[PDB]
Symmetry: C5
Subunit: 342 residues, 5 copies
Amino acid sequence: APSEFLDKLMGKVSGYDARIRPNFKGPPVNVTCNIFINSFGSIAETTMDYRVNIFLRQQWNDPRLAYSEYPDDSLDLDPSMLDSIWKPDLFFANEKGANFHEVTTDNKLLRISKNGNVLYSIRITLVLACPMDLKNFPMDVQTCIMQLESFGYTMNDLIFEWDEKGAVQVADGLTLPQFILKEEKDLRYCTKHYNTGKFTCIEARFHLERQMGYYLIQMYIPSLLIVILSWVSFWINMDAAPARVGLGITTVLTMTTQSSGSRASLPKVSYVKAIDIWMAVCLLFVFSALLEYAAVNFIARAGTKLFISRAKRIDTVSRVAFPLVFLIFNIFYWITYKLVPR
Amino acid sequence: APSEFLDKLMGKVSGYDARIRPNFKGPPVNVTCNIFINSFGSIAETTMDYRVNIFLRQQWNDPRLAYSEYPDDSLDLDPSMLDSIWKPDLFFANEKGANFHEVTTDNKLLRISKNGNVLYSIRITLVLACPMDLKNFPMDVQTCIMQLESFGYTMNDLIFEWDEKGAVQVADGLTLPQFILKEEKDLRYCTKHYNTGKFTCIEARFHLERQMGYYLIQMYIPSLLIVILSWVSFWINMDAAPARVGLGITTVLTMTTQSSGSRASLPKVSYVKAIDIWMAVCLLFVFSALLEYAAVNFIARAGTKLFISRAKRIDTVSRVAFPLVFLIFNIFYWITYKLVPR
Amino acid sequence: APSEFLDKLMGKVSGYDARIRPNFKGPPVNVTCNIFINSFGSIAETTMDYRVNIFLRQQWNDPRLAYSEYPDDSLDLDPSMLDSIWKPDLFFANEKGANFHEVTTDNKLLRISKNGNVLYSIRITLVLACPMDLKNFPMDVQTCIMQLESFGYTMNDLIFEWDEKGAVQVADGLTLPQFILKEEKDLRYCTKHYNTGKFTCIEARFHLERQMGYYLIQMYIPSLLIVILSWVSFWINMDAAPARVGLGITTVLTMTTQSSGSRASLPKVSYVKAIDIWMAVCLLFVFSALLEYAAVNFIARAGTKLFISRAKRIDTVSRVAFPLVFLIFNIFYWITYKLVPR
Amino acid sequence: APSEFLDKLMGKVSGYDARIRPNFKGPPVNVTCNIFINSFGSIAETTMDYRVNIFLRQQWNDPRLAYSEYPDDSLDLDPSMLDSIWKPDLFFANEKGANFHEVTTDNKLLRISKNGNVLYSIRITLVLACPMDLKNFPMDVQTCIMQLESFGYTMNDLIFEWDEKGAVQVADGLTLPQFILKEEKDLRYCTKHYNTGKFTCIEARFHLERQMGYYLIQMYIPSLLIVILSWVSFWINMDAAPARVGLGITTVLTMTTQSSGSRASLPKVSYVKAIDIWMAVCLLFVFSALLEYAAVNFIARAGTKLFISRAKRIDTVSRVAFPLVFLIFNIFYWITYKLVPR
Amino acid sequence: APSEFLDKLMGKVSGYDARIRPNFKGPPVNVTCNIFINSFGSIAETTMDYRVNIFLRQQWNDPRLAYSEYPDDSLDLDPSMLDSIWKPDLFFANEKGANFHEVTTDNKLLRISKNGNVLYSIRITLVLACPMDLKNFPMDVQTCIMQLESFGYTMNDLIFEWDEKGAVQVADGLTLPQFILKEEKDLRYCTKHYNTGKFTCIEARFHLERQMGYYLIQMYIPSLLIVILSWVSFWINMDAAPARVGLGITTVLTMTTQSSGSRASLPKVSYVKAIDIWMAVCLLFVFSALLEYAAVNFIARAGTKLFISRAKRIDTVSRVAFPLVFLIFNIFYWITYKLVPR
Ligand SMILES: CC[C@H](C)[C@H]1O[C@]2(CC[C@@H]1C)C[C@@H]1C[C@@H](C/C=C(\C)[C@@H](O[C@H]3C[C@H](OC)[C@@H](O[C@H]4C[C@H](OC)[C@@H](O)[C@H](C)O4)[C@H](C)O3)[C@@H](C)/C=C/C=C3\CO[C@@H]4[C@H](O)C(C)=C[C@@H](C(=O)O1)[C@]34O)O2
Ligand SMILES: CC[C@H](C)[C@H]1O[C@]2(CC[C@@H]1C)C[C@@H]1C[C@@H](C/C=C(\C)[C@@H](O[C@H]3C[C@H](OC)[C@@H](O[C@H]4C[C@H](OC)[C@@H](O)[C@H](C)O4)[C@H](C)O3)[C@@H](C)/C=C/C=C3\CO[C@@H]4[C@H](O)C(C)=C[C@@H](C(=O)O1)[C@]34O)O2
Ligand SMILES: CC[C@H](C)[C@H]1O[C@]2(CC[C@@H]1C)C[C@@H]1C[C@@H](C/C=C(\C)[C@@H](O[C@H]3C[C@H](OC)[C@@H](O[C@H]4C[C@H](OC)[C@@H](O)[C@H](C)O4)[C@H](C)O3)[C@@H](C)/C=C/C=C3\CO[C@@H]4[C@H](O)C(C)=C[C@@H](C(=O)O1)[C@]34O)O2
Ligand SMILES: CC[C@H](C)[C@H]1O[C@]2(CC[C@@H]1C)C[C@@H]1C[C@@H](C/C=C(\C)[C@@H](O[C@H]3C[C@H](OC)[C@@H](O[C@H]4C[C@H](OC)[C@@H](O)[C@H](C)O4)[C@H](C)O3)[C@@H](C)/C=C/C=C3\CO[C@@H]4[C@H](O)C(C)=C[C@@H](C(=O)O1)[C@]34O)O2
Ligand SMILES: CC[C@H](C)[C@H]1O[C@]2(CC[C@@H]1C)C[C@@H]1C[C@@H](C/C=C(\C)[C@@H](O[C@H]3C[C@H](OC)[C@@H](O[C@H]4C[C@H](OC)[C@@H](O)[C@H](C)O4)[C@H](C)O3)[C@@H](C)/C=C/C=C3\CO[C@@H]4[C@H](O)C(C)=C[C@@H](C(=O)O1)[C@]34O)O2
């Protein structure tokens, strides 16, 4: 009897056809699909893509599946039965490849309401290639988008609509080590025009903000320290050229290395990153320090002690100048990027 | 005759249906599942996931499979027969992808007791994404969790229960090169609430403790050595500025490199790692050493021999001071992290 | 009735055979295929290949599929039905491996016009091995080619023709981080002669131009800076040999490192890259600077003050000479590669 | 007729059942299986696993397959026929994943003797995770083990036995770039006890010895050279502090780098590697050299020429001492690890 | 009618059996197979394997497929039909894994001549593990071999023969960035003896020669340059110890780094590479230069000006000596490896 009902509803009997669209030659089937995202992982600037595995819940009703037989409002069909019924055909457009998880049983959940409402749920792993603007790199906000489109049928045949309440849910305990996701999530329609015809698509937005802890600790602090080293360099007498030339050279080299280190993590990009203007100014200051020492030597290795007194003056006034120029730059710098954002 | 019994029990005859849940429209099927874990491998902080391949043994009884025909209490069915019978549908929630091992035969073991108890065993390889807190990195205890949930049916239909005795077993000879697993294993229920309904889950806990041998040998000892180099630097006369500036610079650079080296292995993280406070203090001491030499020079390059005597005093008192401040820091440091843990 | 038409047109009835070519033993089937390319990604010089995922739209008409039954000009058949009809067999020749995207439904779109025109669309991910000439590396234009050939039948049986209008389309918002694609796209026939017979092929051209921003910021500027360091080195008195030897050595070493850094990204290649002539000249200038200092010392460590005056002359005239020789080289250099291209 | 015999022996006729074990409800089936190993490849200490692809030849007789029809002692059945007959189910326990090679035809060889002896051969690629002890790393002997167990049936049902003569064969021309395999091969039974029951297993042993050429050339020689540099450092007068401090520092730094270099290849391990005691002693000697120079300076920068004469004595006696202490250490070192092994 | 002929020739009618070998119980089937290689790619010394994707064309005639029905000499069967006919079973022995390309249609080409000659063509991607001798690394000739063997049947059943004319063809435009392939190609039989029996194999030879451009530009030139730096070092007066010690140390360090750099690309190997003798001699010369400076100091820091004159003599005679010893070594070196090869 219970098997007999799976056989009666879905059997060849009643002439049910998998291939034919529900309510065919008529109003477009409306699919309400909401996604529950388990995790973001392996977000890489260089690879340019981010991994997310999601439950996809799509709901479409067809009149023909509706049954008067059982008391229960919704009956849970077997996962295999699902291969038999018509399914809405939905591919991630930017998907860059994706896979089901078939571990143990195939992971799929389907249930038919007596009304004829169908609930269909699948667990997918997605790699998604999102374009991301690095115009200001360290502290930027990046938007990651996923758009679900129907490759099979045109606009008149099929439509996608987000669920009116709670269209995208996130894991209760989900955190990203590198970025923080924002509670506010934008959802917006799109319509794709292709040579073949117009295909429906719906896209979610995700907003992610870069954690400043790691970059502060790694990128900025050593720069600050190295810049301190020039400052301590100034106090040593000009008579010892090696100590000054040694500090200047060593510091400029280290700044070079520190600068490349930032570059290795990132994808190769034409426009100047904020990190680059920071490195350019730090390097400009150490180079200017060595430059000042060079000028002091040009005056000192030249001649008369009156000039050497002049140079002992420029030493003090310089040592007072550099922390001020660096500090004022720093102040002027932080406001634009980390304050009044967007 | 023996084939005739596989054909009689599992045949179309008797109207056995694969798709229908055992004891349908009634008390939820109870699955007692215990796992035997062959190995942990490729645990990587950066990838954030750990590999484990496990035997999964799940036991559920259904009345309809029960047979009075044979003398034997448990009969071992063919591995293919398994595709025909109803199986409890169980997916690892955090699985991040997983695969069966089909090498030679498909690796699956099933047996039916005359009572109707079914024993079902499969060999799976799992990658598992466990969130791990690095708040104190080198010596931390990390908890790795795996939760088994039923994607197919709600709470009223199906339930998972760990076996009362020996729910998780480990290989007799299993060792992890990086961590040690703890004999005490916590097992605790969870219930998942999703928009679709409430799904049963059961989760194991694994506790892993970081081996301090490698990090002691690699991370800490070279730091100690480099800090010794400042100490030997102090004894050289202040008259030779290059030897002192050379030692100070070289040591601070090496400390910088040593510090980055720790960072390369780890995933990028916002909160300060214990290794970082260690590096910060070591670097602070070498920098303070160079700083003291700079002050000594400010007094020395300045003027009168009374001051130079003053500086020869500060040399000795400093050389006595640094091992004490470093030693007291070290003592104060170890207690918090490696003593009175958690 | 609607199922009955899928059954009538494609049924065993009417004796339709999948295996037989349309209009068999006659004029070669003509396939008009246009591709819509979603993205280029992971273009790597070292791996030598570039990833592109494309929609492939191929159109061939066969008389036998044509139907008089429906009012609609084009009817959209089910994606599975596609396995039944004869398909033009088309493999990417240089494909180096490729995969369909079967996520959710298999992603395939097919429709039959009453005329008998068939539209067939598939979404594919391609890795493509394109040979690329590095003769001038940093600023080069690279051509990436994909050729679609029929492995199954000879020229007399089958032919490929690009669509007369809009044979290749690109995503409206598509950008490549490393290169820019050019609007002008060349399309040209090819015919392959193999021992078996002659097979049709059609190949698209893509032209890509290297972004000069990243290489300017990374490769060239540090070179400029390091070359500046020699210039500042000259001013320090020759009396201090260490400062001069220190600057010369340090700079030549850094130039060595900078040079290798360029090499690591690129595939190993026999012919000299433009970047290499740039590095060779920069290194030649720093080496020549140190060389001049060495000559100055050979005169200076030798003897009489008249010679030392001679050397103080060569210092000034040299410091005036080096920026001129470097600047004139730079000017002479840029014209060939970034100006009057091809 | 020849097809008729495949149809008669393996047909539904005679009531042959694939699922049922040979000689069912009786003495355990005995499988004699010998392996021919094509190659070892990609043996990596860090990944901890080694690749081997093997032919597996397993022989079990069943009475029912035996035929009186043909003259030939052994008849070669079609590779597909193999799917129909019962196969012994054998999975590599530590397999960590493995794959068949299906290129061209599926690669499988089966033949049935009239006696009823069945020869079954398959070509498999295995990744095998072998635990390996690094207690003395550079020159160690490592044992790699593969154990073949039956996941399907208990001890009473099935048994594995190595072939009495030539159970494991190796390719005639097989060589490993990193290790050498030893002709003597140990083969030993194991029995696995699991909660389900006792399962048969048979394990091969492979013994591999590390090639000392590469590590001698790479690891040890540069250490020797750097240690020579301290020796040449001693001869330079103590009056020039920079040359001595320069050599001491530079050499200790280089030793640090050389030491890390060894570490990068290896998996992270708690226990001290032999390479580490070697590095510790080399570094101890360079550090002791710099230390002696520091003491000499403490005496020299202090005061009276009688002390400076004392120091010129300690220079000579030291320069005589260091090659002796290093040489005697070297001698004492090599004996334990490369002599009287195990 | 045309379908009726596929049904008549290959139908169950006429009692055609896929499983049975052509001309069974008789003279061994003779397969003439020629390969057309599209590309070599990703040849890596470290991975030890090289990728090649090839068309495999194998020709065997069977009497039973021969038909008198059509006028055409050769008829092209459908790619699926191929699964039905008997195929020669041919696996690459060293294949290390390989895959078909199933993109769009499965890529397979088959045609049956009325004579009964069958032409069968498949497109395969192969990874091939070739053993390669590095005894002289930079400029070596390496032979890469692929051997095609029949795993299914013995010598008496099946045989492989290369096509008498043009057995291996190469792409008209094929080039390898790292090596050049030689027009002369050796083809030679092999017979494999295994415990099971004797299996036929045929192997192609490929000869590849290393491009000297990249290694000249990268490996050798910087060595030459660094060796020049010692030469320029000699001219500086011995009075400044730091400039000489600085140049000697810096150069020996850089030589160390340059030496390791070569090692990173290559697989770990016991026997001494030619590149190693080159590095050993270069390093020996820089070390000998520093050594000579040390001796000069032992004489100079010692005492009387007559000795200092002696040392100013050894300076000149040395500076004349080193370019000669290095040049004569270079000459003596190149002849063995790049001249009179093999
Ligand atoms: C003339 C430069 C000399 C050598 C000066 O160098 C120094 C010191 C003083 C010298 C006189 C140091 C140098 C920076 C320069 C000053 C330059 C800048 C602050 C910026 O660059 C300028 C010019 C540049 O166009 C030549 C321009 O880019 C274009 C590219 C695109 O158009 C096609 C477009 O997007 C738009 C038009 O922008 C830029 C906007 O503006 C800044 C971008 C450069 C930073 C420099 C660096 C950043 O990572 C490098 C690395 O970390 C390293 C090793 C050293 C750094 C350095 O060496 O920093 C570094 O190379 O000062
Ligand atoms: C002012 C710093 C100057 C340059 C001082 O530098 C030195 C020497 C003396 C200078 C005056 C050396 C420097 C450390 C500083 C002292 C700083 C610390 C001990 C710590 O940082 C402070 C400030 C920091 O917030 C600015 C704060 O982080 C926040 C981040 C998050 O909020 C958004 C939150 O999680 C919480 C609020 O915590 C921290 C807790 O506390 C410590 C974290 C820094 C260690 C420094 C380093 C660790 O890896 C780096 C690397 O190995 C390297 C190359 C050098 C190191 C270094 O250069 O170490 C390094 O960069 O002293
Ligand atoms: C004699 C050289 C001495 C050591 C000189 O070195 C320096 C300084 C002065 C010394 C006297 C520095 C050196 C370059 C040389 C001058 C050489 C060139 C400008 C070029 O090379 C010459 C000769 C070379 O054939 C020996 C020839 O290649 C052939 C190869 C192929 O035939 C089989 C064919 O394609 C065609 C015939 O071309 C070339 C065309 O032309 C240039 C190619 C070399 C650049 C050098 C380098 C580029 O990356 C290297 C790296 O960044 C590094 C660490 C240092 C660089 C360097 O060390 O640069 C570097 O190694 O000058
Ligand atoms: C006090 C050390 C000072 C800094 C001394 O450092 C130097 C010079 C003189 C200083 C006074 C140099 C230093 C070694 C020390 C002497 C130490 C050893 C020879 C060994 O270590 C000792 C102590 C160590 O337990 C603290 C102990 O490990 C335990 C770990 C486990 O228990 C939990 C267990 O398995 C068992 C109990 O063993 C060890 C057995 O025995 C040796 C192991 C250390 C070698 C050092 C190094 C090896 O790779 C490192 C790297 O290449 C580098 C950059 C420098 C090396 C160095 O710096 O070498 C290095 O760090 O001497
Ligand atoms: C005693 C050596 C001292 C330290 C001398 O070092 C220097 C300078 C002068 C010192 C007195 C420098 C040193 C080489 C030596 C001279 C040695 C050689 C030219 C060669 O080696 C000798 C001895 C060696 O067996 C100990 C032997 O190998 C065996 C291995 C196998 O048997 C089991 C077998 O295959 C066969 C018997 O061959 C070899 C054939 O012959 C040469 C091979 C060594 C080259 C050295 C190096 C190559 O890459 C290394 C790297 O780039 C680096 C950082 C420095 C190099 C170096 O340091 O080079 C380096 O380590 O001279």
